[PDB]
Each structure stands twice: as structure tokens, then as C-alpha cells.
Amino acid sequence: TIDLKNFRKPGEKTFTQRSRLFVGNLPPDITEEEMRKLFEKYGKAGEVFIHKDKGFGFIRLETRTLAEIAKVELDNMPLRGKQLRVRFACHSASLTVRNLPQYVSNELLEEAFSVFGQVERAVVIVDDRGRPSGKGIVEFSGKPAARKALDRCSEGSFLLTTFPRPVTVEPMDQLDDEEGLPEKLVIKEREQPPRFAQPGSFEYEYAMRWKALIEMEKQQQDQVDRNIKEAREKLEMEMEAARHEHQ
Amino acid sequence: EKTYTQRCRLFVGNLPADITEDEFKRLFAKYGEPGEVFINKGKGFGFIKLESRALAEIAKAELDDTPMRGRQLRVRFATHAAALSVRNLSPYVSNELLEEAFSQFGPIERAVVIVDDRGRSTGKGIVEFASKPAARKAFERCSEGVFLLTTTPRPVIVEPLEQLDDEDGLPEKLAQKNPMYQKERETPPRFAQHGTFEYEYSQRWKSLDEMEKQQREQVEKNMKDAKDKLESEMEDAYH
Ligand SMILES: [Cl-]
Ligand SMILES: [Cl-]
Ligand SMILES: [Cl-]
Ligand SMILES: [Cl-]
Ligand SMILES: [Cl-]
């Protein structure tokens, strides 16, 4: 395909880790200028790391748009007999923020955590109807800024708005639902293909015991939902009572 | 692959009030022949299917946050209406095995096994069908009956996929709709210092969150011990 400009978004920070592309399965006879020439179509390129002996490397494009266009056009593309594996590199300084207050936004989350370092991107997770789920993502420029935010919020209570409930900051558990699990090695489990177990057989009997504890956890996870709910309303009632109290 | 799938439909929000059916197609003109086109002229949003997922991802990347007669356009992928959550997977289920398994319920648009940062399966997966009744059939039969993927009688738990949005979050422009958002921002972000009126309750909130963590990690630990004993007594497979 072909389309031009640098495709910068209004007020977008350029050359972040979001525009960092991992390029795998490279041929062993490739140099730095050759990979820059391969991405010459997608604008200016910043850092370029290469492992010639192993066949992978890194390249950071200007914006997220140019990186998404370079991914869809170069992924699984032949090059000197080998197929290229283009994939967004995992963010090395990403943080998960839970227990967000009711009124939050991406800019509020970015401005708040900017006191620990240079925030590349902050996002408030929203559901299907645009409602926040209470979880957020904060991505910093470097690892020390992310660890600083993690330490300060682990031993101290970091408040985003007026409501006195601190947010919970955890390291980002990067889950991949794009490449997935195409294939693996031999740990026999696939002697029998996928099937519906016949009612009365040993497979059906033993699998119903598995569904029993699955729904047992659902009741226990819902029971702790009620234990926290009643203690939450008790604390919220104690706050509105102290709100009226003023000497 | 297949052309004009549900994974190719794009959501274009914040359209002008006088948007027409044919003018909406002029935007995605250089992305091939437009597929199914629908626009909500009242709210000012619309859907459009492109020929492939690649063309849809390019049009989304180029047209998102772009002006049109004054209003900024919000381009994103439409929420897949025929998506199912697949969990309780053995660590030996691949994307092809998951696709081949759920293919008997209908045409599969995609099927992936969610993995961690290293590449190991998390026991959960996603399956997206071509039609919602096809996903309903897979959801009913797997819940009413027992659907196995490997030799071990480990049933698969199928649920409707709660699709969250971590790409485009909640912008501040959309947060200004509720007046209490500006009321909450009267106090800037801060750390609660001792002696404050809010410090006493901030620690009680953090103590309540620690109590919630200890109880949920105790529940998830008891299930893992129960899930390990099931694979232990399975060695005694003789009736
Ligand atoms: Cl760079
Ligand atoms: Cl909607
Ligand atoms: Cl609607
Ligand atoms: Cl949608
Ligand atoms: Cl079920």
C-alpha cells in the first residue's frame, strides 16, 4: 500500500515505546542501514538495535500510526527466504492502576503520575457503554520512573481527586491476545480430538466435578464481594458522618 | 482470512449532524470497496466494514483523531458482537486447537489463546464467530454439556466476552459531561499526610483493599489445591 504524511495525533508524544517495533526472524546478512531502508516508507526512525548473530532487533518509528501501518505491511513478509515477524515490543515501564475513583480521565491519570517521571501514556479502561472499570494503565518513559511510582504508592496513599480513597499501583501483567499460542512442544493429551463427553461416562462424571469447583469459586468470589461491600458502606457512612462534623 | 468480516467493521463516532450515507463512504474511499454501511444520524456515529482486517487497521490508524467539518472523528474497531470468553484451558491448547474445536459450532473469525509476557498460556482464550447465533450455540452446548479439548476430562468454561477498551480510554473532553468531575478536580493529586482529615479514612480504604486481597488470594489458592487433587485422583481412572 501507499499513503503519506507523518500522521501525528493532536498533542501526541513521538518516539515512545508504543511506536517501538520488534522485528524477528531477520536474515543473518542484514545491517543497520538495510533495516532503516526497509522502514524508509514509514517516516523517520529513531533508535535501531540489531542482533546480527541471532536475527532480531528493534526499531522505533515516529508515531503509533506509522508503527501500526508498518506492522500490517511487513508482518509475515518474505525477506531473503525468511518470513519477517513484526510485532509491537512489550512496554518495559508499564504500570497497572486499580481502585480508580468514580470521576477519572486519561489526562487526570497522566497529570497525577507525572510527579514520578515522564509519562508516555495513561489510559482509563472503559467497558462497552463507556463506563470506567476502575482499572487504569500508566506507561512511563523509563524503568526508574515506574519503580518510583510503584514504591511511593505501595507505602503511601496516593489520592487522585477529593475522595479519600488511594489507588492501587501494580506492575503491568502484559497479556497477549494477538499472537496467542500458535504451537508448543511435547511435555499424549491430544490422542483424542475435541469432543462432547457422553453423559454417564467417566469423562462426563469427572468433568462435572471440575465444573463443581469452578462454580464453587464463583460463590466464594461472590461471597467476598458481599463482605467487602458491607464494610465499604460502613466506611462510607462513617465518612459522610464526619463530613457533617465541623467545629 | 475471509472478506468483510465482523473484525473488519469500524466505529466512526462524532460525525457531523448532516452526514449522509454516501458522504460517509467518501471518507473510506481509498480503502477499497466499502462493505456494510450504517450510520446513526441522530447520535452521529456509524459503522463500516472494509475488505480485510489489514485495510481496517490502516483506515483506523489514519482517520482516528482527524477533523471533519469541525468535529474530531473517533475511529475504532466496533465491539465484536459474537465474541466468547474461553477459560479453564489446559496449558497445551493452541490457537489452532482452540479454533478447530469451536469450528463445529460455526465459522470462526478468530481464536487465540491468551499468553503471559513469556509466552505461556494463562488458561484463558478468546473465540470470535461470524454470527451471534453461532456463538450462542457454542455458549449453550458448552455450558449445558461437557466439551473437552484434550484427553484429560478438563471441561471448557464458555462465557460472553467482556470486551474492555484499553486503547482509547476516557478522554477529559468526555469527562467534562458530568459536573462533579470538575468538583473532584478541585483537589489536585496528592499524598495523604498524617494529621489530615482525609488521612484517617485513606488508611482505612487501603486496609479494606488489603483485606479484599487476602480473602481473594485465599479463595484462588483453595481452588488451585482442589484443581490439583482432581488431577491426582484422575490417576486412579479405574472405576
Ligand atoms: Cl528513539
Ligand atoms: Cl455504542
Ligand atoms: Cl446507540
Ligand atoms: Cl461498537
Ligand atoms: Cl459451563
Short mmCIF file of C-alpha atoms and ligand atoms in Angstrom, two decimals:
data_model
loop_
_atom_site.label_atom_id
_atom_site.label_comp_id
_atom_site.label_asym_id
_atom_site.label_seq_id
_atom_site.Cartn_x
_atom_site.Cartn_y
_atom_site.Cartn_z
CA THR A 1 0.00 0.00 0.00
CA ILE A 2 0.94 3.69 -0.05
CA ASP A 3 -0.09 6.83 1.87
CA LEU A 4 1.92 9.78 3.12
CA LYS A 5 2.44 12.31 5.95
CA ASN A 6 3.88 11.74 9.43
CA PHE A 7 0.38 11.12 10.85
CA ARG A 8 0.89 12.83 14.20
CA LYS A 9 -2.07 12.93 16.54
CA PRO A 10 -3.11 16.21 18.24
CA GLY A 11 -0.62 16.62 21.06
CA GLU A 12 0.92 13.17 20.64
CA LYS A 13 4.35 12.40 22.08
CA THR A 14 6.57 10.92 19.38
CA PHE A 15 9.12 8.09 19.56
CA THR A 16 7.54 6.45 22.60
CA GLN A 17 7.59 2.72 23.33
CA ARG A 18 4.16 2.45 21.68
CA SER A 19 5.90 3.04 18.32
CA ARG A 20 8.63 0.52 19.18
CA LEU A 21 8.53 -2.47 16.82
CA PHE A 22 10.16 -5.84 17.42
CA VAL A 23 11.33 -7.41 14.15
CA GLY A 24 12.16 -11.11 14.45
CA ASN A 25 13.44 -13.90 12.21
CA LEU A 26 15.68 -11.46 10.33
CA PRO A 27 18.22 -12.88 7.88
CA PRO A 28 21.77 -13.08 9.28
CA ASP A 29 23.08 -10.85 6.46
CA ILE A 30 21.39 -7.59 7.45
CA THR A 31 22.82 -4.28 8.68
CA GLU A 32 21.52 -1.12 10.33
CA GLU A 33 21.09 0.82 7.08
CA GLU A 34 19.28 -2.12 5.46
CA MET A 35 16.57 -2.24 8.14
CA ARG A 36 16.24 1.55 8.03
CA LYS A 37 15.75 1.26 4.27
CA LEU A 38 13.04 -1.35 4.86
CA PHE A 39 11.17 1.13 7.08
CA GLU A 40 12.07 4.19 4.98
CA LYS A 41 8.46 4.35 3.76
CA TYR A 42 7.08 4.86 7.28
CA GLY A 43 8.92 8.09 8.07
CA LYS A 44 11.83 8.94 10.32
CA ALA A 45 13.18 6.14 12.52
CA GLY A 46 14.81 6.72 15.89
CA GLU A 47 16.71 4.01 17.74
CA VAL A 48 17.76 0.89 15.82
CA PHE A 49 19.07 -2.15 17.71
CA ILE A 50 20.23 -5.28 15.87
CA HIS A 51 21.45 -8.73 16.93
CA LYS A 52 23.01 -9.94 13.67
CA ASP A 53 24.05 -13.35 15.01
CA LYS A 54 20.57 -14.15 16.34
CA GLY A 55 18.35 -12.49 13.73
CA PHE A 56 16.19 -9.98 15.62
CA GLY A 57 16.28 -6.31 16.53
CA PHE A 58 14.38 -3.19 17.50
CA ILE A 59 13.29 -0.10 15.59
CA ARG A 60 11.22 2.82 16.90
CA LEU A 61 9.09 4.75 14.42
CA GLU A 62 7.74 8.27 14.88
CA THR A 63 4.11 7.69 15.91
CA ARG A 64 1.81 4.81 16.79
CA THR A 65 0.03 5.22 13.45
CA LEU A 66 3.21 4.72 11.42
CA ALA A 67 4.05 1.67 13.54
CA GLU A 68 0.63 0.07 13.02
CA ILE A 69 0.90 0.65 9.27
CA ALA A 70 4.44 -0.77 9.19
CA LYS A 71 3.28 -3.82 11.15
CA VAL A 72 0.38 -4.75 8.87
CA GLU A 73 2.52 -4.33 5.73
CA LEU A 74 5.73 -6.07 6.86
CA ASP A 75 4.47 -8.84 9.16
CA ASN A 76 4.82 -12.31 7.60
CA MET A 77 6.58 -10.80 4.57
CA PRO A 78 9.39 -12.72 2.84
CA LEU A 79 12.90 -11.29 3.00
CA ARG A 80 15.91 -13.28 1.73
CA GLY A 81 13.92 -16.51 2.01
CA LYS A 82 12.69 -15.91 5.57
CA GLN A 83 9.37 -14.51 6.77
CA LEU A 84 9.56 -11.38 8.90
CA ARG A 85 7.94 -11.37 12.35
CA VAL A 86 6.93 -7.76 13.07
CA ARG A 87 5.33 -7.21 16.47
CA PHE A 88 4.92 -4.33 18.91
CA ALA A 89 7.56 -4.62 21.61
CA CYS A 90 6.34 -5.04 25.17
CA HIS A 91 6.38 -1.85 27.24
CA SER A 92 9.23 -2.14 29.75
CA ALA A 93 7.85 0.59 32.07
CA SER A 94 4.10 -0.03 32.24
CA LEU A 95 2.03 0.08 35.44
CA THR A 96 -1.45 -1.15 36.33
CA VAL A 97 -3.60 1.17 38.46
CA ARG A 98 -6.65 -0.24 40.24
CA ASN A 99 -9.36 1.21 42.50
CA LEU A 100 -9.69 4.40 40.48
CA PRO A 101 -12.23 6.94 41.78
CA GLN A 102 -15.54 7.45 40.01
CA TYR A 103 -14.57 10.61 38.09
CA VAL A 104 -11.34 9.88 36.21
CA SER A 105 -9.89 10.53 32.76
CA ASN A 106 -6.77 9.81 30.75
CA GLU A 107 -5.42 13.34 31.28
CA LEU A 108 -6.05 13.21 35.04
CA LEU A 109 -4.22 9.88 35.29
CA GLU A 110 -1.33 11.25 33.22
CA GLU A 111 -1.05 14.51 35.17
CA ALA A 112 -1.20 12.67 38.51
CA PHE A 113 1.53 10.09 37.86
CA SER A 114 3.70 12.71 36.11
CA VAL A 115 5.12 13.55 39.56
CA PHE A 116 7.17 10.32 39.39
CA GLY A 117 8.67 10.83 35.93
CA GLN A 118 7.87 11.33 32.25
CA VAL A 119 4.54 9.64 31.50
CA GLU A 120 4.31 8.39 27.92
CA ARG A 121 0.64 7.35 28.05
CA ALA A 122 -2.13 6.97 30.63
CA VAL A 123 -5.44 5.25 29.88
CA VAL A 124 -8.61 4.71 31.92
CA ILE A 125 -10.07 1.34 30.94
CA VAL A 126 -13.70 1.68 29.83
CA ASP A 127 -16.28 -1.01 29.10
CA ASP A 128 -18.82 -1.33 26.28
CA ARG A 129 -21.04 1.57 27.43
CA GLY A 130 -18.16 3.98 28.06
CA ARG A 131 -18.18 3.42 31.83
CA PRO A 132 -14.84 3.13 33.64
CA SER A 133 -14.00 -0.31 35.03
CA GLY A 134 -11.90 1.09 37.88
CA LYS A 135 -8.62 -0.09 36.34
CA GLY A 136 -6.06 2.05 34.55
CA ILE A 137 -2.75 1.84 32.71
CA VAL A 138 0.21 4.18 33.22
CA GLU A 139 3.26 3.91 30.95
CA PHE A 140 6.44 5.80 31.85
CA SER A 141 9.48 6.76 29.80
CA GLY A 142 11.90 4.59 31.77
CA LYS A 143 12.03 1.89 34.41
CA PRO A 144 13.22 4.12 37.32
CA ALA A 145 10.16 6.35 36.88
CA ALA A 146 7.84 3.33 37.01
CA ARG A 147 9.57 1.88 40.08
CA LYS A 148 9.43 5.29 41.78
CA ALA A 149 5.67 5.41 41.24
CA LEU A 150 5.39 1.79 42.42
CA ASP A 151 7.34 2.39 45.64
CA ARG A 152 5.70 5.70 46.57
CA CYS A 153 2.20 4.27 46.07
CA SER A 154 2.92 0.97 47.85
CA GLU A 155 3.91 2.51 51.20
CA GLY A 156 1.92 5.74 50.83
CA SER A 157 -1.69 6.55 49.92
CA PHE A 158 -1.78 8.34 46.56
CA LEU A 159 -5.04 10.26 46.04
CA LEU A 160 -6.14 11.42 42.59
CA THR A 161 -9.18 13.57 43.45
CA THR A 162 -11.01 14.87 46.52
CA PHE A 163 -12.42 11.48 47.52
CA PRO A 164 -10.02 9.97 50.11
CA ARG A 165 -9.54 6.53 48.56
CA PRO A 166 -6.00 5.76 47.34
CA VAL A 167 -5.38 3.95 44.07
CA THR A 168 -3.58 0.60 43.93
CA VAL A 169 -0.47 0.50 41.72
CA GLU A 170 0.80 -2.85 40.44
CA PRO A 171 3.33 -3.85 37.77
CA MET A 172 1.61 -4.35 34.43
CA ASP A 173 0.89 -8.03 33.76
CA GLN A 174 1.30 -7.92 29.99
CA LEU A 175 -1.24 -10.27 28.41
CA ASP A 176 -1.07 -11.10 24.69
CA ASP A 177 -4.27 -11.87 22.78
CA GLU A 178 -2.82 -11.11 19.32
CA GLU A 179 -0.09 -13.65 18.56
CA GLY A 180 -1.51 -16.06 21.13
CA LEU A 181 -0.19 -19.62 21.40
CA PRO A 182 0.31 -20.92 17.84
CA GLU A 183 2.26 -24.05 18.79
CA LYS A 184 4.32 -25.58 21.60
CA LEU A 185 6.47 -28.62 22.38
CA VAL A 186 5.89 -32.09 23.85
CA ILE A 187 5.58 -32.03 27.64
CA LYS A 188 -0.38 -37.51 24.62
CA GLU A 189 -3.16 -35.17 25.71
CA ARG A 190 -4.25 -34.94 22.05
CA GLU A 191 -4.74 -38.65 21.41
CA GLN A 192 -8.49 -37.92 21.41
CA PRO A 193 -9.79 -34.89 19.47
CA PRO A 194 -12.09 -32.24 20.95
CA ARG A 195 -15.44 -33.81 21.74
CA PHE A 196 -18.57 -33.68 23.88
CA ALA A 197 -18.40 -36.17 26.73
CA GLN A 198 -21.17 -38.76 26.78
CA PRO A 199 -23.42 -38.38 29.87
CA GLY A 200 -22.65 -41.25 32.22
CA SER A 201 -19.09 -41.94 31.07
CA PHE A 202 -16.04 -41.43 33.28
CA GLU A 203 -15.08 -38.30 31.32
CA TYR A 204 -18.51 -36.73 31.86
CA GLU A 205 -18.57 -37.72 35.54
CA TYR A 206 -15.07 -36.43 36.26
CA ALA A 207 -15.55 -33.20 34.29
CA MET A 208 -18.69 -32.35 36.27
CA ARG A 209 -16.52 -32.42 39.39
CA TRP A 210 -14.34 -29.84 37.66
CA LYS A 211 -17.36 -27.62 36.96
CA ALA A 212 -18.35 -28.04 40.62
CA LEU A 213 -15.24 -26.32 41.99
CA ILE A 214 -15.34 -23.74 39.17
CA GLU A 215 -18.80 -22.65 40.32
CA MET A 216 -17.69 -23.11 43.93
CA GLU A 217 -15.05 -20.42 43.41
CA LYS A 218 -17.72 -18.24 41.79
CA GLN A 219 -19.76 -18.42 45.00
CA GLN A 220 -16.70 -17.74 47.18
CA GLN A 221 -15.58 -14.88 44.94
CA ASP A 222 -19.13 -13.51 45.21
CA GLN A 223 -19.17 -14.05 48.99
CA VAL A 224 -16.09 -11.86 49.40
CA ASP A 225 -17.87 -9.40 47.10
CA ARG A 226 -20.52 -9.09 49.82
CA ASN A 227 -18.04 -8.98 52.72
CA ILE A 228 -16.18 -6.05 51.16
CA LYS A 229 -19.50 -4.46 50.16
CA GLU A 230 -20.88 -4.24 53.71
CA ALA A 231 -17.58 -2.98 55.14
CA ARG A 232 -17.39 -0.45 52.29
CA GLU A 233 -20.82 1.00 53.07
CA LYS A 234 -19.89 1.08 56.76
CA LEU A 235 -16.79 3.14 55.94
CA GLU A 236 -18.70 5.40 53.54
CA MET A 237 -21.35 6.01 56.21
CA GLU A 238 -18.60 6.93 58.68
CA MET A 239 -17.13 9.40 56.17
CA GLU A 240 -20.40 11.23 55.48
CA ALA A 241 -20.94 11.44 59.24
CA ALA A 242 -17.51 13.03 59.72
CA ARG A 243 -18.25 15.28 56.72
CA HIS A 244 -21.07 16.88 58.72
CA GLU A 245 -18.78 17.25 61.77
CA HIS A 246 -17.07 20.65 61.77
CA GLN A 247 -16.11 22.56 64.91
CA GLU B 1 -8.99 -14.93 6.23
CA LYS B 2 -12.36 -14.20 4.57
CA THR B 3 -13.50 -10.77 3.38
CA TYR B 4 -15.74 -8.21 5.12
CA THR B 5 -15.85 -9.98 8.48
CA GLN B 6 -17.10 -8.50 11.75
CA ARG B 7 -13.45 -7.93 12.69
CA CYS B 8 -13.33 -5.53 9.71
CA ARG B 9 -16.16 -3.27 10.91
CA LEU B 10 -15.00 0.14 12.16
CA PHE B 11 -16.81 2.51 14.52
CA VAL B 12 -16.73 6.16 13.44
CA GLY B 13 -18.14 8.44 16.13
CA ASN B 14 -18.69 12.19 16.45
CA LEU B 15 -19.95 12.65 12.90
CA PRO B 16 -21.42 15.95 11.66
CA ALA B 17 -25.15 16.41 12.11
CA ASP B 18 -25.76 16.49 8.33
CA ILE B 19 -23.79 13.34 7.49
CA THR B 20 -25.25 11.27 4.65
CA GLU B 21 -24.94 7.62 3.66
CA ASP B 22 -22.80 8.34 0.59
CA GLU B 23 -20.60 11.06 2.12
CA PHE B 24 -19.67 8.64 4.90
CA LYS B 25 -18.32 6.31 2.20
CA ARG B 26 -16.22 9.09 0.65
CA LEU B 27 -14.01 9.05 3.76
CA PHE B 28 -13.04 5.38 3.35
CA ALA B 29 -12.85 5.71 -0.44
CA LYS B 30 -9.14 4.90 -0.78
CA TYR B 31 -9.55 1.67 1.25
CA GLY B 32 -11.30 -0.45 -1.37
CA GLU B 33 -14.97 -1.15 -1.85
CA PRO B 34 -16.97 -0.30 1.30
CA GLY B 35 -18.96 -3.15 2.80
CA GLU B 36 -21.94 -2.91 5.14
CA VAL B 37 -22.51 0.78 5.91
CA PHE B 38 -24.81 2.02 8.68
CA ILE B 39 -24.87 5.45 10.31
CA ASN B 40 -26.85 6.71 13.31
CA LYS B 41 -27.68 10.18 12.00
CA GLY B 42 -29.18 11.15 15.37
CA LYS B 43 -26.29 10.36 17.70
CA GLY B 44 -23.77 10.98 14.92
CA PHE B 45 -21.91 7.67 14.66
CA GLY B 46 -21.68 4.95 12.06
CA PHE B 47 -20.27 1.55 11.16
CA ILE B 48 -18.48 0.40 8.01
CA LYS B 49 -16.96 -2.95 7.03
CA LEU B 50 -13.75 -2.96 4.99
CA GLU B 51 -12.50 -5.75 2.76
CA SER B 52 -9.88 -7.06 5.21
CA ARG B 53 -8.64 -6.57 8.76
CA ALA B 54 -5.43 -5.05 7.37
CA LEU B 55 -7.33 -2.36 5.46
CA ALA B 56 -9.45 -1.74 8.57
CA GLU B 57 -6.40 -1.29 10.80
CA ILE B 58 -4.85 1.14 8.30
CA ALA B 59 -8.03 3.22 7.96
CA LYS B 60 -8.40 3.26 11.75
CA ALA B 61 -4.81 4.44 12.22
CA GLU B 62 -5.11 7.19 9.59
CA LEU B 63 -8.61 8.53 10.32
CA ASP B 64 -8.62 8.46 14.13
CA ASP B 65 -8.29 11.94 15.66
CA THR B 66 -8.88 13.72 12.34
CA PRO B 67 -11.21 16.68 11.72
CA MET B 68 -14.31 16.65 9.53
CA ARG B 69 -16.25 19.91 9.12
CA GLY B 70 -15.20 20.98 12.61
CA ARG B 71 -15.81 17.86 14.69
CA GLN B 72 -12.99 15.47 15.55
CA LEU B 73 -13.65 11.88 14.50
CA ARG B 74 -13.31 8.91 16.87
CA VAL B 75 -12.37 5.88 14.75
CA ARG B 76 -12.10 2.49 16.45
CA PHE B 77 -12.99 -1.15 15.88
CA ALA B 78 -16.61 -1.96 16.63
CA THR B 79 -17.24 -4.23 19.60
CA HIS B 80 -17.41 -7.80 18.30
CA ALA B 81 -20.98 -8.94 18.98
CA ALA B 82 -20.10 -12.64 18.55
CA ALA B 83 -17.19 -12.93 20.99
CA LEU B 84 -16.94 -15.63 23.67
CA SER B 85 -14.66 -15.94 26.69
CA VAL B 86 -12.95 -19.35 26.84
CA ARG B 87 -11.24 -20.33 30.10
CA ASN B 88 -10.14 -23.35 32.16
CA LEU B 89 -7.88 -24.32 29.26
CA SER B 90 -5.08 -26.81 29.72
CA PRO B 91 -1.59 -25.32 29.17
CA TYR B 92 -1.37 -27.43 25.99
CA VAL B 93 -4.22 -25.83 23.99
CA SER B 94 -3.03 -23.88 20.95
CA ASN B 95 -4.80 -21.30 18.79
CA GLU B 96 -5.36 -23.88 16.05
CA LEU B 97 -6.62 -26.47 18.54
CA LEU B 98 -8.99 -23.87 20.01
CA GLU B 99 -10.14 -22.89 16.51
CA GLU B 100 -10.53 -26.49 15.30
CA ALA B 101 -12.51 -27.31 18.45
CA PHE B 102 -15.03 -24.46 18.27
CA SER B 103 -15.26 -24.65 14.46
CA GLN B 104 -18.04 -27.25 14.73
CA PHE B 105 -20.35 -24.55 16.14
CA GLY B 106 -19.91 -22.25 13.13
CA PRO B 107 -17.43 -20.25 11.05
CA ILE B 108 -14.60 -18.93 13.23
CA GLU B 109 -13.41 -15.38 12.60
CA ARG B 110 -10.51 -15.76 15.05
CA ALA B 111 -9.46 -17.85 18.04
CA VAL B 112 -6.42 -17.07 20.20
CA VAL B 113 -5.02 -18.38 23.49
CA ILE B 114 -4.12 -15.54 25.85
CA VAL B 115 -0.50 -15.85 26.97
CA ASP B 116 1.66 -14.07 29.54
CA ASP B 117 4.74 -11.92 28.91
CA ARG B 118 6.88 -15.05 28.41
CA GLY B 119 4.55 -16.98 26.11
CA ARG B 120 2.93 -19.45 28.50
CA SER B 121 -0.83 -19.93 28.36
CA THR B 122 -2.87 -18.26 31.10
CA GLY B 123 -5.65 -20.85 30.90
CA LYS B 124 -7.97 -18.39 29.13
CA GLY B 125 -8.76 -17.71 25.49
CA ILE B 126 -10.96 -15.80 23.06
CA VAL B 127 -13.15 -17.17 20.26
CA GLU B 128 -14.98 -14.91 17.80
CA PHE B 129 -17.61 -16.35 15.46
CA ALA B 130 -19.05 -14.97 12.22
CA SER B 131 -22.57 -14.63 13.66
CA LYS B 132 -24.01 -14.17 17.15
CA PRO B 133 -26.31 -17.23 16.91
CA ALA B 134 -23.19 -19.27 16.14
CA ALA B 135 -21.60 -18.02 19.37
CA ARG B 136 -24.86 -18.63 21.26
CA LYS B 137 -24.82 -22.26 20.11
CA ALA B 138 -21.23 -22.69 21.33
CA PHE B 139 -22.09 -20.99 24.63
CA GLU B 140 -25.19 -23.11 25.27
CA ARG B 141 -23.78 -26.54 24.39
CA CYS B 142 -20.53 -25.99 26.31
CA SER B 143 -22.44 -24.88 29.42
CA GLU B 144 -25.35 -27.35 29.21
CA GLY B 145 -23.00 -30.21 28.33
CA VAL B 146 -19.33 -31.11 28.73
CA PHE B 147 -16.93 -30.04 25.98
CA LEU B 148 -13.39 -31.44 26.20
CA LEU B 149 -10.35 -30.49 24.13
CA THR B 150 -7.68 -32.96 25.30
CA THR B 151 -7.62 -36.48 26.74
CA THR B 152 -7.89 -35.16 30.30
CA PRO B 153 -11.59 -34.57 31.16
CA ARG B 154 -10.97 -30.85 31.71
CA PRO B 155 -14.16 -29.06 30.60
CA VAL B 156 -14.01 -25.67 28.92
CA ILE B 157 -15.89 -22.79 30.54
CA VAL B 158 -17.53 -20.57 27.91
CA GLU B 159 -18.85 -17.11 28.82
CA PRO B 160 -19.73 -13.96 26.87
CA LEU B 161 -16.55 -11.96 26.40
CA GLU B 162 -16.50 -8.72 28.39
CA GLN B 163 -14.68 -6.52 25.86
CA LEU B 164 -12.80 -3.72 27.61
CA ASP B 165 -11.24 -0.69 25.91
CA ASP B 166 -7.62 -0.02 26.91
CA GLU B 167 -6.65 1.72 23.65
CA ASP B 168 -8.82 4.85 23.66
CA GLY B 169 -9.67 5.36 27.33
CA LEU B 170 -11.92 8.05 28.80
CA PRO B 171 -10.73 11.42 27.45
CA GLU B 172 -11.09 14.53 29.58
CA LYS B 173 -13.37 16.11 26.97
CA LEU B 174 -15.91 13.32 27.53
CA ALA B 175 -15.34 13.52 31.30
CA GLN B 176 -16.49 17.16 31.37
CA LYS B 177 -20.06 15.99 30.69
CA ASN B 178 -20.59 15.21 34.39
CA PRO B 179 -20.35 18.38 36.54
CA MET B 180 -18.92 16.52 39.55
CA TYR B 181 -15.78 15.76 37.53
CA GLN B 182 -14.67 19.38 37.91
CA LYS B 183 -15.76 19.26 41.56
CA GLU B 184 -13.45 16.30 42.20
CA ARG B 185 -10.57 18.07 40.43
CA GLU B 186 -10.76 20.96 42.92
CA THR B 187 -8.21 18.97 44.93
CA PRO B 188 -5.06 18.17 42.91
CA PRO B 189 -3.39 14.74 43.09
CA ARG B 190 -1.51 14.40 46.35
CA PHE B 191 -0.21 12.03 49.01
CA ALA B 192 -2.28 11.89 52.19
CA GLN B 193 -0.13 13.16 55.05
CA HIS B 194 -0.74 12.25 58.68
CA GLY B 195 -2.92 14.62 60.68
CA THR B 196 -5.22 15.37 57.74
CA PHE B 197 -8.96 14.83 58.00
CA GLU B 198 -8.78 12.53 54.95
CA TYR B 199 -5.70 10.62 56.15
CA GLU B 200 -7.61 8.58 58.74
CA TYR B 201 -10.03 7.26 56.10
CA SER B 202 -7.40 6.86 53.37
CA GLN B 203 -5.65 4.28 55.55
CA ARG B 204 -8.98 2.56 56.22
CA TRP B 205 -9.60 2.32 52.47
CA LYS B 206 -6.09 0.91 51.98
CA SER B 207 -6.74 -1.51 54.85
CA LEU B 208 -10.03 -2.57 53.25
CA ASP B 209 -8.25 -3.19 49.94
CA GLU B 210 -5.65 -5.30 51.76
CA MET B 211 -8.46 -7.31 53.38
CA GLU B 212 -10.03 -7.83 49.95
CA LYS B 213 -6.68 -9.01 48.57
CA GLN B 214 -6.12 -11.50 51.40
CA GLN B 215 -9.59 -13.02 51.02
CA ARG B 216 -9.49 -13.32 47.22
CA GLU B 217 -5.99 -14.83 47.24
CA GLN B 218 -7.26 -17.34 49.81
CA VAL B 219 -10.17 -18.34 47.55
CA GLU B 220 -7.97 -18.63 44.46
CA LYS B 221 -5.48 -20.70 46.48
CA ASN B 222 -8.14 -23.17 47.63
CA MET B 223 -9.32 -23.76 44.05
CA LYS B 224 -5.77 -24.43 42.86
CA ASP B 225 -5.35 -27.01 45.62
CA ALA B 226 -8.70 -28.53 44.63
CA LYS B 227 -7.79 -28.46 40.93
CA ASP B 228 -4.54 -30.29 41.71
CA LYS B 229 -6.30 -33.03 43.69
CA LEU B 230 -8.65 -33.70 40.76
CA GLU B 231 -5.67 -34.44 38.52
CA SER B 232 -4.28 -36.59 41.35
CA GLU B 233 -7.33 -38.84 41.75
CA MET B 234 -7.57 -38.99 37.95
CA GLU B 235 -4.53 -41.29 38.04
CA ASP B 236 -6.99 -43.72 39.67
CA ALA B 237 -9.06 -43.69 36.48
CA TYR B 238 -10.29 -47.25 37.12
CA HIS B 239 -13.90 -47.28 38.33
CL CL C 1 14.26 6.61 19.71
CL CL C 2 -22.03 2.12 21.00
CL CL C 3 -26.60 3.52 20.48
CL CL C 4 -19.11 -0.53 18.81
CL CL C 5 -20.01 -24.14 31.80
#
